[PDB]
Amino acid sequence: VTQNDGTTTIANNLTSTVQVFTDSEYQLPYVLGSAHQGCLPPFPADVFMVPQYGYLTLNNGSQAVGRSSFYCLEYFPSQMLRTGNNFTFSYTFEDVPFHSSYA
Amino acid sequence: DGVGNSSGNWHCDSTWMGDRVITTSTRTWALPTYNNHLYKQISSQSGASNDNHYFGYSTPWGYFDFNRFHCHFSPRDWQRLINNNWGFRPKRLSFKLFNIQVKEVTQNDGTTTIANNLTSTVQVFTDSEYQLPYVLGSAHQGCLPPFPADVFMVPQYGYLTLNNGSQAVGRSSFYCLEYFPSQMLRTGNNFTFSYTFEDVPFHSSYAHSQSLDRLMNPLIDQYLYYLSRTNTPSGTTTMSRLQFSQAGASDIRDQSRNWLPGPCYRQQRVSKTAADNNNSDYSWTGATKYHLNGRDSLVNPGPAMASHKDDEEKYFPQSGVLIFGKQDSGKTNVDIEKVMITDEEEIRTTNPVATEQYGSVSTNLQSGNTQAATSDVNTQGVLPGMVWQDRDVYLQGPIWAKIPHTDGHFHPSPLMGGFGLKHPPPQILIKNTPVPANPSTTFSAAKFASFITQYSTGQVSVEIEWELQKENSKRWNPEIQYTSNYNKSVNVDFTVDTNGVYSEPRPIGTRYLTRNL
Amino acid sequence: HSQSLDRLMNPLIDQYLYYLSRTNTPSGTTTMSRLQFSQAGASDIRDQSRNWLPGPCYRQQRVSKTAADNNNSDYSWTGATKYHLNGRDSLVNPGPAMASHKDDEEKYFPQSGVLIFGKQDSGKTNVDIEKVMITDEEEIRTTNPVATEQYGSVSTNLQSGNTQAATSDVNTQGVLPGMVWQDRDVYLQGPIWAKIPHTDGHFHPSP
Amino acid sequence: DGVGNSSGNWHCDSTWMGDRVITTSTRTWALPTYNNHLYKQISSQSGASNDNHYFGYSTPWGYFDFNRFHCHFSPRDWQRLINNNWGFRPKRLSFKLFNIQVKEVTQNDGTTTIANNLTSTVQVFTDSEYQLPYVLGSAHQGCLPPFPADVFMVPQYGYLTLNNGSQAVGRSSFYCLEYFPSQMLRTGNNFTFSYTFEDVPFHSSYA
């Protein structure tokens, strides 16, 4: 996006890249456990914004205890994708008891 | 292959296989155009001091330097290597440049707009024959940033040659880089090269548990006598008849010792407490210096010598310690609380204190009428039977340096720190190919003075394979380790602040584990 | 060499290592002493941290080819450099490889420390200067000390509020770790080889 | 092949194998449009001197001339060849054009902006049958620059024929270059040709 005293114009950038990684070793704070917004919308016609990623650690008051560990995500291997690349991964669930829908 | 298909994947990882650790790091760089695509000689302005004259050329090219450690090791990966291992040396590295994109900037009375230029090229070459001035040996800025989220500018490449005053001696040779074979890269090409290190002794991360002065069993006394009392009282006339005594635990200072301390160059001593140091301008006139070809040159690193003796943490050698700045430290006349002064007390066992003299030496021959006289020896070169420890690498300090090609050299390990190599990792130079702009219709022989204004950017991937020396010891009691303190503080150490500025709190030396001497 | 030890780095970018720039700072004209640091760059190169040092040197006396300048005294021996073992003073003719002179002096040369050859039909004793051919070793001037000038200065005493910092020139410097040097040149007339004496130990066997 | 893949690598090197030396040189050129894409005859203005009348055509085409030495030899490579050798002659050459990019300039009351034109082409041909006026024989400007960092403009191509005064004699023949077969090159094509020299006596560098 280019802004010049208003009238900003969007022009596709072919060369730029988008980098994606799935941890799969569970070495990151797991944010997904709690209910939050920004999931895929219910109704497929919608278009959704991808939510930001942050995390909390141990603390005393507002100050940080030496225990708190700060993770840098840039430090994992991640696949980089220009226009015309696709990133696909497959996951298999451990066996878990049925959910009981009966009353 | 193509504009749409991406050339390489981001690899930043550290894997600890067993003996060997493989450290990979990837960064994003941006390369401007230097000197408007033309060489220029540079020289000392007018005149300043006889010592500061220099002559050299400044090329449009620019180069990558990963020579610092913290490029490769995260502070945590540094902590593992440092605590669990005696020694480590590199084995082989591989370098990769990918996802290059060239951008052309247009300026029209402000509101400049950047629009990608697909056709333009970026040319890269690694010498590997060492036919260029090797710039990488000395500490400099512009290395890969410590923290992978950062984006760094690729530094310009220039070099210095022989000179008399500001003028150039016929000996000086000017190298044109355009004259090497170099690979040219459009968007969608990647340049990768692999280098293997010559075998080099391990870096010693251990500190000694004994000192040279105390290398013997205190329980049993030696079979070798020494002069104990030169004169013996008789009738109060103090007649001089020499006597001898065996050496033991009671009087250890006289025991015969097998080896001596490492060679030392004396330094001036300054203290961190501002009140104690003298009120005078001794920054230069009082400094230690060494001069060749009539130009005094300060000695910053000096030979590896302990910074201070015990029960003094205040004092440190004037010139002779590595000094690093904290976050956003100024570039000149900064106050003391801004810089981080490293401490080399770990070496205190085998090497002399930098401030105190090597020892005293007897000057004259005694006689009935003359008293025996001795004098301190400020400087001591190497003698047979001397042992010493090299200066520490730390985290920020350089990894290696190039031994100059010379007739002879003694103990090639560099003074700053790291691994002296005869064939260092070759320099990687990179430049934007110049693109002319709107040549006039009628012919003119004069060369183009005006080009498109453009720069290029893309990722760079450096991977080094380190070999380790596993720690095998029998010490009963626990060691010293590098531990981040558990007290609560505003900012965690080695982490970003609230504005996003990554800061390294203190210098981390590599010597914690203890081997007996 | 096309470079010198003192100038082995890129002038464009300044180093990340600080050094003491100004020991004391003016305040109320009382000159209170608080030390300050500065990074090193092209502007003040003489202070940049350098990786290696100059080759070991043995000091020589300096004589000049112009006959008027040299002192009117018999210093041919009493002023010469000497080294003695087993109580017999022995002149050092070759000396360690050290540059004969600094720049902008072609007049001076070390007293004992240069190879000297005779021209055709030169006498065998007390020959005049214009008869001998004095070799010049300025090529080495980069990595090795000048034979006449001292290796460097060294701080003698510890500073204090009441004592000024004092330093002293170091005339002789043995080898330290991290020193590099160049060997003396062969020339055309000089010898091809020599025999390393059989001994317990020897350092850098080049003659 | 494609817009993204680069056509050729920069080669500038000089290798001395033994008897033979192979000199390579690479430069960057820029080619404007001459005469707004149309032929024109040119002739001596009005009149000046009987000797200076000329008649000829000026084509839009432009040509490469590497005919000077210092294109190929760096001053140092020249010094080696010149000092150690009696004579030298060429054997075979190879010529390569790569990484062609066409740019279209737009002018709108100033602030002209250049934006790459991907579709446009550049057409090149080497005659090799010697059916054209040979311009290269005489010393002229516009050769490859001595120093590889430079960027040079490709010179225009024109030629002279027989004439009487400023007027043209029926004998004069006007060549249209468009009439040869020529390879056309978009971005991502490279044009290379190889030529072998007839045997010619050595140049004598001895005195």
Write the SSE topology.
This is part of a larger assembly, with 4 copies of chain A.
Chain A: E1 18-20, E2 59-60, E3 63-64, E4 79-81
Antiparallel strand pairs in A: 1-4, 2-3
PDB class: virus
Keywords: Icosahedron, vector, therapeutic, beta-barrel, virus
Entry title: Cryo-EM structure of AAV True Type
| Helical run tally of chain A | 0
Q: What kind of oligomer do you see? A: part of a larger assembly
> N-to-C SSE series of chain A?
EEEE
Number of strands of chain A: 4
Largest sheet of chain A: 2 strands, antiparallel
What is the overall shape of chain A?
A: extended
Q: What proportion of the residues of chain A is helical, as a percent range?
A: under 10%
Strand content of chain A: 5-15%
The chain-level structural class of chain A is little secondary structure
How are strands sequenced across the largest beta sheet of chain A? 1-4
Q: Radius of gyration of chain A, rounded?
A: 20 Å
In whole angstroms, how far apart are the ends of chain A? Answer: 55 Å
Largest interface: B-C, 106 and 90 residues
